[PDB]
PDB file of C-alpha atoms and ligand atoms in Angstrom:
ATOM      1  CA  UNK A   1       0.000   0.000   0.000  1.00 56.52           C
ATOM      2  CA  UNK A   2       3.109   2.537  -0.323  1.00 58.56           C
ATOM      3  CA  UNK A   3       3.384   1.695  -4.305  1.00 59.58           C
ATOM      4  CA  UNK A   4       1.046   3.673  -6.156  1.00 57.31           C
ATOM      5  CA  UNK A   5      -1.798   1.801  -6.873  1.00 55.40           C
ATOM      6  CA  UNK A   6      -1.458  -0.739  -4.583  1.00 54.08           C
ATOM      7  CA  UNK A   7      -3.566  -2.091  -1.260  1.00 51.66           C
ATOM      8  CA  UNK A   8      -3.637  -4.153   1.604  1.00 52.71           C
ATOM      9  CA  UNK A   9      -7.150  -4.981   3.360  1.00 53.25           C
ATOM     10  CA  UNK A  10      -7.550  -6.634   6.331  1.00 54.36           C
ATOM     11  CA  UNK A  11     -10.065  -7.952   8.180  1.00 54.40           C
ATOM     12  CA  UNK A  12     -10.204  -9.717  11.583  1.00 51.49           C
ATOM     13  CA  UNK A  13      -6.498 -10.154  11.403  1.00 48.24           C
ATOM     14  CA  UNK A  14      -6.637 -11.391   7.697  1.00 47.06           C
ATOM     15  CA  UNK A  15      -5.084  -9.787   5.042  1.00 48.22           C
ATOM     16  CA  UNK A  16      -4.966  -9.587   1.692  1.00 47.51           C
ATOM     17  CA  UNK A  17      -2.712  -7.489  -0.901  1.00 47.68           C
ATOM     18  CA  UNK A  18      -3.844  -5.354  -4.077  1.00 45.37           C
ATOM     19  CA  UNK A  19      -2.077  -4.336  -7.518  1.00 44.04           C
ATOM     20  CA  UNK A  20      -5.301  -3.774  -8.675  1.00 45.96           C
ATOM     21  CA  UNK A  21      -6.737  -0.362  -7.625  1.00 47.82           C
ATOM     22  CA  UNK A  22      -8.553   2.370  -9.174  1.00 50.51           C
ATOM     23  CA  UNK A  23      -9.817   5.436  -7.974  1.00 47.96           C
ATOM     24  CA  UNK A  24     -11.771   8.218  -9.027  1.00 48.79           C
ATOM     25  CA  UNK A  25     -13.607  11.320  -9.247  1.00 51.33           C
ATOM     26  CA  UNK A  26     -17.487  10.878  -8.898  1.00 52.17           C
ATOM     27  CA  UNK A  27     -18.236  14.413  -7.788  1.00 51.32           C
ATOM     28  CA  UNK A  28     -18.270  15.606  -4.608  1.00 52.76           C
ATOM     29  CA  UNK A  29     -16.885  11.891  -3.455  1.00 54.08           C
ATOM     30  CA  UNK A  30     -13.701  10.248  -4.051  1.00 54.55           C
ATOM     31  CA  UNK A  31     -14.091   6.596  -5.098  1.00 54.29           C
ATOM     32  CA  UNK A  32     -11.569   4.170  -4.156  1.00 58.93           C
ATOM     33  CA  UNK A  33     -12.242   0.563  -5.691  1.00 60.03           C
ATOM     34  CA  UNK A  34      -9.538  -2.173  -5.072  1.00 58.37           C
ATOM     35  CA  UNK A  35      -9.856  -5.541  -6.129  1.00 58.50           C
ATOM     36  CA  UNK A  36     -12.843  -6.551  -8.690  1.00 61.29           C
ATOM     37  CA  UNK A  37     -16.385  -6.894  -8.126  1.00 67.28           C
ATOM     38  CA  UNK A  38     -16.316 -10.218  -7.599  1.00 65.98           C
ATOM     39  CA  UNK A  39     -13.546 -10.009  -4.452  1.00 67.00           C
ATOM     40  CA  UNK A  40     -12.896  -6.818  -3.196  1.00 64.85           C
ATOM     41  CA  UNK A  41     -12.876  -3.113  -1.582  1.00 61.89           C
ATOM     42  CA  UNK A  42     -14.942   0.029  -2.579  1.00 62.87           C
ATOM     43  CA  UNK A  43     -14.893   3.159  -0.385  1.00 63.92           C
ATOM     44  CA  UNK A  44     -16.634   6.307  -0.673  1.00 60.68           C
ATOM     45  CA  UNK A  45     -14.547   9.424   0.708  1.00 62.46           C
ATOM     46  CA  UNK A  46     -16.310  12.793   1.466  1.00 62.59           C
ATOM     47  CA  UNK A  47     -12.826  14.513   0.735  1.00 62.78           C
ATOM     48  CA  UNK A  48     -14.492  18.345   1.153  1.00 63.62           C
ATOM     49  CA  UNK A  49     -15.144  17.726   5.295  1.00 65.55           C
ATOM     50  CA  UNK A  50     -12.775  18.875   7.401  1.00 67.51           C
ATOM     51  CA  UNK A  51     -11.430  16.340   8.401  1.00 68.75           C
ATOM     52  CA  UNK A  52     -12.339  13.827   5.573  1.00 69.86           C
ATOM     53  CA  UNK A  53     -15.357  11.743   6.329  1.00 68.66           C
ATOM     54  CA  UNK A  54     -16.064   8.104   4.759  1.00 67.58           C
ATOM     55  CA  UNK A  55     -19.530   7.782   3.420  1.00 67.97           C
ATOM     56  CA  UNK A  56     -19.536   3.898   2.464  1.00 67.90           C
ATOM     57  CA  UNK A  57     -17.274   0.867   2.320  1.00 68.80           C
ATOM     58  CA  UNK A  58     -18.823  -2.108   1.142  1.00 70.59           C
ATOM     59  CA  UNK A  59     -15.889  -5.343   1.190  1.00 69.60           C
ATOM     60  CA  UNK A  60     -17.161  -8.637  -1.301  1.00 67.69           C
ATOM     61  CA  UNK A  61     -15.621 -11.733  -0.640  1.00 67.95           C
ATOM     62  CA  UNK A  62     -12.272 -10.662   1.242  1.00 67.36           C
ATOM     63  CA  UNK A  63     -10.617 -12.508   3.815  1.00 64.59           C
ATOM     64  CA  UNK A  64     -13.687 -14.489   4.108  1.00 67.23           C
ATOM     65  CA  UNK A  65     -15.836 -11.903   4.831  1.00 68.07           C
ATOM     66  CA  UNK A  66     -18.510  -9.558   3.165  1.00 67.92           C
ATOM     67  CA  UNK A  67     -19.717  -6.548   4.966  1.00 66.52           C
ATOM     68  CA  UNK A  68     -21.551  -3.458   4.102  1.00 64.36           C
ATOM     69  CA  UNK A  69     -21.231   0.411   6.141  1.00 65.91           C
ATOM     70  CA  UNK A  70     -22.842   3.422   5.642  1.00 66.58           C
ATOM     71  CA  UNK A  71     -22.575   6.637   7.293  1.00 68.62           C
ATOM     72  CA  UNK A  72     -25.707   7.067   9.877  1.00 67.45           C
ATOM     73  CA  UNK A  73     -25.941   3.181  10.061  1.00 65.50           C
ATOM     74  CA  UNK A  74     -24.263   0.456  12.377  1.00 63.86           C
ATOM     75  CA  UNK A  75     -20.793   0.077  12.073  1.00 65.77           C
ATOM     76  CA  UNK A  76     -17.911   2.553  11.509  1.00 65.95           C
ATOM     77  CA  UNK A  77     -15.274   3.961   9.475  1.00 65.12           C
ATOM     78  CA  UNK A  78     -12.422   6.853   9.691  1.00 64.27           C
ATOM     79  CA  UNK A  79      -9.910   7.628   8.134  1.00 61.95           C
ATOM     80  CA  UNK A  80      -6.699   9.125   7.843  1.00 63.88           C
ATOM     81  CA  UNK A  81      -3.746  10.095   5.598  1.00 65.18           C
ATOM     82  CA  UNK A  82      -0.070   9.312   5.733  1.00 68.33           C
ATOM     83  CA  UNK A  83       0.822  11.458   2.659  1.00 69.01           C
ATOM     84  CA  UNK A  84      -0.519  10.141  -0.725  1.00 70.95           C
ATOM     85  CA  UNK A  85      -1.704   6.964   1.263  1.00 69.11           C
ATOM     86  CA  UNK A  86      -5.384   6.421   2.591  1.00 68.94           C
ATOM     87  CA  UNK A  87      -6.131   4.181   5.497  1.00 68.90           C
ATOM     88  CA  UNK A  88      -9.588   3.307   6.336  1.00 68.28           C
ATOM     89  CA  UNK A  89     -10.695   1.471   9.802  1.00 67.24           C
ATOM     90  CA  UNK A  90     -13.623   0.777  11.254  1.00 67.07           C
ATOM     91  CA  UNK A  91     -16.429  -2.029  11.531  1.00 66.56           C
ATOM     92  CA  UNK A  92     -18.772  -3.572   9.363  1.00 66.70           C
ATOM     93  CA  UNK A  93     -22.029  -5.857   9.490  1.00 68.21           C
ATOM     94  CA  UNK A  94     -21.725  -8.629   7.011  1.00 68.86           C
ATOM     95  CA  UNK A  95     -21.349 -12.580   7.046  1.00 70.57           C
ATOM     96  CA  UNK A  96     -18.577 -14.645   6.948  1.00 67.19           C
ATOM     97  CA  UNK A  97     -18.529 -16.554   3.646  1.00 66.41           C
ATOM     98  CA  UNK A  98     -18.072 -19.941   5.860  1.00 64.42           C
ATOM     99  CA  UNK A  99     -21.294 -19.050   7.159  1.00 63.14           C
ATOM    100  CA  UNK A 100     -23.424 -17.032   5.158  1.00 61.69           C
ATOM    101  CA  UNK A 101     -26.512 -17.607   7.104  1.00 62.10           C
ATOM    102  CA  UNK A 102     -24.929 -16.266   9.885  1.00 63.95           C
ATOM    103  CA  UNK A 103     -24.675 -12.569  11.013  1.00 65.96           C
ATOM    104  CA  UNK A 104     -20.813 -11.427  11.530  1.00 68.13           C
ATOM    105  CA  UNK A 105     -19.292  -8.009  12.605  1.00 70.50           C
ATOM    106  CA  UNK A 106     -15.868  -7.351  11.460  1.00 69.43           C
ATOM    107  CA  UNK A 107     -13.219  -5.281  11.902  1.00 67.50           C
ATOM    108  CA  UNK A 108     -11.322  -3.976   9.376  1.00 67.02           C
ATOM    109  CA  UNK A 109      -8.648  -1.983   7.977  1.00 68.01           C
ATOM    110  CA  UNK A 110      -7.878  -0.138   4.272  1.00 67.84           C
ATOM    111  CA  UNK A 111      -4.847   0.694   3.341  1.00 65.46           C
ATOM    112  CA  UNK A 112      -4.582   1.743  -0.118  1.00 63.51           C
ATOM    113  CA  UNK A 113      -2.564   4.671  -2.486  1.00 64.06           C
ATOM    114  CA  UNK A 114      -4.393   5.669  -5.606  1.00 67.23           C
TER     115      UNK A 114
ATOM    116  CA  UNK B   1     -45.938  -2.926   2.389  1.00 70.04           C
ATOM    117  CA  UNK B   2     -49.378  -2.403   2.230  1.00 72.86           C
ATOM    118  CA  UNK B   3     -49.703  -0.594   5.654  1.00 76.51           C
ATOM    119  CA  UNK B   4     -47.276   1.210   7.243  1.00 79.67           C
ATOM    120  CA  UNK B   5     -43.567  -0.340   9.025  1.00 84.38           C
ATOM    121  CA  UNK B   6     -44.345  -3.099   6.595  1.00 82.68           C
ATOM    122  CA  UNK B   7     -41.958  -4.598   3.571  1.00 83.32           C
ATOM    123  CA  UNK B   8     -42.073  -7.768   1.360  1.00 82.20           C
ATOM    124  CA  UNK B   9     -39.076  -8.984   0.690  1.00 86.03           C
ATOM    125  CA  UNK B  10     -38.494 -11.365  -2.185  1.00 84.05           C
ATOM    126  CA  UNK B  11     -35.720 -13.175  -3.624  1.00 84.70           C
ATOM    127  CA  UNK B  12     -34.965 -15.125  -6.999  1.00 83.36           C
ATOM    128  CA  UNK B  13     -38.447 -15.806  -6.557  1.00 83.71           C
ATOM    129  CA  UNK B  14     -39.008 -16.780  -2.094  1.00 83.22           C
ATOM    130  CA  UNK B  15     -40.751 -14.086  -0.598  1.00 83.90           C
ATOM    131  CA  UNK B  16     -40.592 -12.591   3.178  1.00 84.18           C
ATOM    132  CA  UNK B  17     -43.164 -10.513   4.318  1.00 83.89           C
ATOM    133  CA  UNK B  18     -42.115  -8.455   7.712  1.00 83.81           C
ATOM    134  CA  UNK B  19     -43.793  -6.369  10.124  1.00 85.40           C
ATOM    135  CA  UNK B  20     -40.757  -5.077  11.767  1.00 81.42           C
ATOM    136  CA  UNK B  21     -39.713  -2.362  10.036  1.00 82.87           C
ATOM    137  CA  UNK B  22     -37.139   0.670  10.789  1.00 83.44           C
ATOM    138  CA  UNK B  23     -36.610   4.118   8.832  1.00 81.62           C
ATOM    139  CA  UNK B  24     -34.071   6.339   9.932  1.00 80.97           C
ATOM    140  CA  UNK B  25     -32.653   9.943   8.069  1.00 79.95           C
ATOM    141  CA  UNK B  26     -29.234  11.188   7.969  1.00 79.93           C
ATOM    142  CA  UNK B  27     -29.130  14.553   5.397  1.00 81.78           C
ATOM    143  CA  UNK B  28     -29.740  12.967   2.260  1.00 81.93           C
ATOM    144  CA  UNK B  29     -30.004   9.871   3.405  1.00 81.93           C
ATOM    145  CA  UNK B  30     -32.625   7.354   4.077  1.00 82.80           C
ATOM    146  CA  UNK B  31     -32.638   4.124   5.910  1.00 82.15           C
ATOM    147  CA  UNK B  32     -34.611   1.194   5.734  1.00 82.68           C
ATOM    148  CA  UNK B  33     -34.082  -1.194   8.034  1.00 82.73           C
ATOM    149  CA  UNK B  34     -36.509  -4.654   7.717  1.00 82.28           C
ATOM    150  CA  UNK B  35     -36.713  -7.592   9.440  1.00 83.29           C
ATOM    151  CA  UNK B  36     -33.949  -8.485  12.213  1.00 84.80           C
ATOM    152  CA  UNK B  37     -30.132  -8.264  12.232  1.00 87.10           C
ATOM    153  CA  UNK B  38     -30.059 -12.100  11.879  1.00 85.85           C
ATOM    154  CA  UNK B  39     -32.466 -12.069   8.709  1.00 86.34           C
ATOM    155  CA  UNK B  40     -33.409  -9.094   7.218  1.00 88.11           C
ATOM    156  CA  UNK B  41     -32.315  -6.139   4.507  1.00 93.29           C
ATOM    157  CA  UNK B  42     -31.110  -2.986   4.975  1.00 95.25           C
ATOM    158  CA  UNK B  43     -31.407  -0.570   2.480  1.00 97.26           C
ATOM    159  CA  UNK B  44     -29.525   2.756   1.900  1.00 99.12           C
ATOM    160  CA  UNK B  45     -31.543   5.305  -0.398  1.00101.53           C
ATOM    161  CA  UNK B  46     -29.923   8.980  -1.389  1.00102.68           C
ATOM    162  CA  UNK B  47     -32.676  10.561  -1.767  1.00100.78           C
ATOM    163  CA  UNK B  48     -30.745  14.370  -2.862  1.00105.06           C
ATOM    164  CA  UNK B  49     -30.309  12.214  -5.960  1.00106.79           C
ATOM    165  CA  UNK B  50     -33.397  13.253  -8.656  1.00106.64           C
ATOM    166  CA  UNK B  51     -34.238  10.289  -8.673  1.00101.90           C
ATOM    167  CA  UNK B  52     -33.549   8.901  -6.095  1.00 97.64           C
ATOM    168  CA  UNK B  53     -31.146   5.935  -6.029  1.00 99.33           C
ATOM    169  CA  UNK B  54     -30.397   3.122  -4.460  1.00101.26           C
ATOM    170  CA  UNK B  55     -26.879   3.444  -2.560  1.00101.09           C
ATOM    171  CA  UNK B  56     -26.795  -0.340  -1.140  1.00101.71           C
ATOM    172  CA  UNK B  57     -28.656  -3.288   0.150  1.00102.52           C
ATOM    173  CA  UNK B  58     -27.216  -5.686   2.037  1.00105.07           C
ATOM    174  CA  UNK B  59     -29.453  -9.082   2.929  1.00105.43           C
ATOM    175  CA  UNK B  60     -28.730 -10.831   5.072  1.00106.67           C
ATOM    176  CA  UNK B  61     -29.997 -14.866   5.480  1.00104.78           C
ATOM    177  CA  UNK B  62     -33.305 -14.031   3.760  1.00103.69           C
ATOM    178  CA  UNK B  63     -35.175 -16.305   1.446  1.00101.79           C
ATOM    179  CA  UNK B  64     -32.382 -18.428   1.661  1.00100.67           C
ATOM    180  CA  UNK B  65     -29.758 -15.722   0.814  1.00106.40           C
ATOM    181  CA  UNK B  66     -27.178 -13.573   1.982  1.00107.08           C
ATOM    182  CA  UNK B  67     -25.547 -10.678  -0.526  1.00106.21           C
ATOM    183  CA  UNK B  68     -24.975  -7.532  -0.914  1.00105.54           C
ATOM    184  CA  UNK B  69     -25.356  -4.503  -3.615  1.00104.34           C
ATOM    185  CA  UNK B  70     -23.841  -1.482  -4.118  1.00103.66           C
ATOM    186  CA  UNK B  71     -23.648   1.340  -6.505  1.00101.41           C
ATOM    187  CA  UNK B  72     -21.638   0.672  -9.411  1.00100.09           C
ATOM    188  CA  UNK B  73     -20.188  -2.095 -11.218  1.00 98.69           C
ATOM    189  CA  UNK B  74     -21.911  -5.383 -12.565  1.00 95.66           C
ATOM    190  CA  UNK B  75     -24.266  -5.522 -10.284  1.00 94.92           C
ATOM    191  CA  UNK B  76     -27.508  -3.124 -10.468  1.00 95.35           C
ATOM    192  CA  UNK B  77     -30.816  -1.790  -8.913  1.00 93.30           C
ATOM    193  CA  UNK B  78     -33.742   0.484  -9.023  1.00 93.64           C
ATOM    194  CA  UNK B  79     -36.103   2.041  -7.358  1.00 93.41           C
ATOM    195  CA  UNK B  80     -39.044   4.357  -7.691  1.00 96.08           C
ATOM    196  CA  UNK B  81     -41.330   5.795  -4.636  1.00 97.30           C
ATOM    197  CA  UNK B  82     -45.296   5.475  -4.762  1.00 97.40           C
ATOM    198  CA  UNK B  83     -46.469   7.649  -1.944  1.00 97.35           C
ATOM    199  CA  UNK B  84     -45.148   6.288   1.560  1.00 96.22           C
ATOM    200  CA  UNK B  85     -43.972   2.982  -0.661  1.00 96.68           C
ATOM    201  CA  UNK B  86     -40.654   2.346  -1.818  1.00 97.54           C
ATOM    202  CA  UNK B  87     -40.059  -0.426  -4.718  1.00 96.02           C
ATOM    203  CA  UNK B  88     -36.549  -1.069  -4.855  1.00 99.10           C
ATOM    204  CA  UNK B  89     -35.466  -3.905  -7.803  1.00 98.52           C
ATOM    205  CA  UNK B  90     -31.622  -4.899  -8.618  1.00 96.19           C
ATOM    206  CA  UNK B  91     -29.397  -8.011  -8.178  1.00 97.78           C
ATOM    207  CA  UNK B  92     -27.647  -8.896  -4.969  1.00 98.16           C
ATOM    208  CA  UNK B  93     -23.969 -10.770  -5.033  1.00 99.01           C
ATOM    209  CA  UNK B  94     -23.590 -13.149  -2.177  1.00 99.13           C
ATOM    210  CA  UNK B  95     -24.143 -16.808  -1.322  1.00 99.92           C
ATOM    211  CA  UNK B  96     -27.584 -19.338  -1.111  1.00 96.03           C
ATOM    212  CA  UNK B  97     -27.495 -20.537   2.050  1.00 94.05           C
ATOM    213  CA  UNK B  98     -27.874 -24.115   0.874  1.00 96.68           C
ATOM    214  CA  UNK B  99     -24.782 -24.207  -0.803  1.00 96.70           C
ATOM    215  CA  UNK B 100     -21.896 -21.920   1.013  1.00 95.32           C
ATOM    216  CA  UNK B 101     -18.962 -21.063  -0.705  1.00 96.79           C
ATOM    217  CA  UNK B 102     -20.403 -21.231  -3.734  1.00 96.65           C
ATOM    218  CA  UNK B 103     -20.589 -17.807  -4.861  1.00 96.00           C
ATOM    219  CA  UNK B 104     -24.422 -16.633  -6.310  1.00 95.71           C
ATOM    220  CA  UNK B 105     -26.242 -13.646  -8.217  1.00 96.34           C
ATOM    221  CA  UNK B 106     -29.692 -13.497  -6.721  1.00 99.17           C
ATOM    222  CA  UNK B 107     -32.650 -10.864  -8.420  1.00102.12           C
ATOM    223  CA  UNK B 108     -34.096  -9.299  -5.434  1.00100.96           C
ATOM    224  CA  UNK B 109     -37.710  -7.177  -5.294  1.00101.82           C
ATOM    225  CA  UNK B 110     -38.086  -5.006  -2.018  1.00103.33           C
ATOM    226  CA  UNK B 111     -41.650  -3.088  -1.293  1.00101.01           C
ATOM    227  CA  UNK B 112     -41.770  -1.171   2.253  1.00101.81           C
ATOM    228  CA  UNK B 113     -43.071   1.674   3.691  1.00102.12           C
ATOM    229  CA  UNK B 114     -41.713   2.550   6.640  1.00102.59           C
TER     230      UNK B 114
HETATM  231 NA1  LIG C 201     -22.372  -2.948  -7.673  1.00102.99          NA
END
């Protein structure tokens, strides 16, 4: 996650690394996708609050988990910046693809450089 | 939802019908929470958007599914207001419960009011 374009997500203590990362300019938010549809990381990024507020994340099939956040509902997400690079933390209501039937709360952790 | 706090719910076909619903505003932002945390779907509208669109959905062990949507990529949805009702329509990635790990595309038809 200190390459450009690059990310590392984890979640409950799993990880998993990125090459693949695109972000972009959907006026007024910053989208941040990482991965692919299929398996991966898409955050939502109010850059224009002071500080920077995170409006969504939504993680499909990572480290085992799938969750879903959005600002005013249960869960939680910050962020910060270390220079060019974004981390994101927080929790997220989901299920555990082991157990899909089965509610899980995870924690998690973005780190990602556009 | 025919009366009020009331949503069907149905999935590639298996409908829920719920009495336990949950609205809540933030700004632009409407809620929808149905059902329970253990089986239910929670449903994030922007409603500043003219239209209004659907921001994400995320299902959890309903009709024999768990998934999620979000706005953007492969996977869809729509929604139009009649009065108090909301019809939301779009197509949920996740899992069928029956068959875990197995990843699935489910069509998913929500009607509340809250
Ligand atoms: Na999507």
């Amino acid at each position: 996650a200190q390459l450009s374009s690059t990310a590392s997500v984890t979640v409950d203590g799993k990880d998993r690394n990125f090459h693949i990362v695109t972000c972009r300019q959907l006026e007024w938010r910053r989208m941040i996708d990482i991965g692919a549809d299929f398996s991966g990381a898409k955050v939502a990024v109010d850059e224009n609050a002071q500080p920077p507020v995170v409006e969504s994340v939504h993680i499909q099939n990572l480290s085992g988990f799938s969750g879903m956040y959005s600002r005013g509902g249960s869960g939680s997400a910050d962020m910060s910046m270390t220079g060019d690079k974004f981390t994101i933390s927080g929790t997220a209501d989901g299920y555990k693809t082991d157990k899909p039937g089965e509610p899980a709360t995870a924690t998690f952790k973005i780190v990602v450089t556009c």
